[PDB]
Structure 1
């Protein structure tokens, strides 16, 4: 089955015959849903209010 992510995210795929996990930023990957797992990370910027007192 095909899985897609925007450029704002990276997809990590681990599983059968994919022991070194495949990492794709903004693309499509063919995955076995019951024998391989997909995880994601947001590439967005965070505007942090860094207080000091």
Structure 2
């Protein structure tokens, strides 16, 4: 049956004879129960407390610097969303925030 989704999550599923990627976020997909597999990604914006401790500047003086970032998964771009779905499915919000925080 069809599965509605809001605009803060990407519904990407594999069914029967759907080899090309499917980019659905804010729509419906007819899902067979024993054939298709369901996975979800949350597109909600998460804030990052990018903290740098004892970092040297171009003079070399060490200063404690804290940064804040607002990062979101741009589901509008089909190519970028398809790229992101290849690794962000099955990852919790905490790990998703943490990896990009380190980067």
Tell me, in whole angstroms, the C-alpha distance in 1 between the residues paired with 2:39 and 2:23. Answer: 9
Q: Which residue of 1 aligns with 2:3?
A: 3
Q: Which residue of 2 aligns with 1:31?
A: 31
**Larger fraction in strand:** 1
Q: What per-residue deviation string (whole Å, max 9, x for no partner) do you get for residues 2-51 of structure 1?
A: 11111000001113212234220111111111111121111111110111
TM-score by length of 2: 0.46
SS of the residue aligned with 1:10?
Answer: strand
Cα RMSD, aligned residues only: 1.2
Q: Which has the larger radius of gyration?
A: 2
**Larger fraction in helix:** 2
Tell me, in whole angstroms, the C-alpha distance in 2 between the residues paired with 1:14 and 1:34. Answer: 12
Tell me, in whole angstroms, the C-alpha distance in 1 between the residues paired with 2:28 and 2:6. Answer: 9
Mapped contact 2:15–2:31 kept (Cα < 8 A)? no
TM-score by length of 1: 0.82
User: Between Structure 1 and Structure 2, how many residues are aligned?
Assistant: 52
- Any stretches of 5+ residues in structure 1 without a counterpart? none
Moved segments of 4+, more than 3 Å = none
SS of the residue aligned with 1:19?
Answer: coil
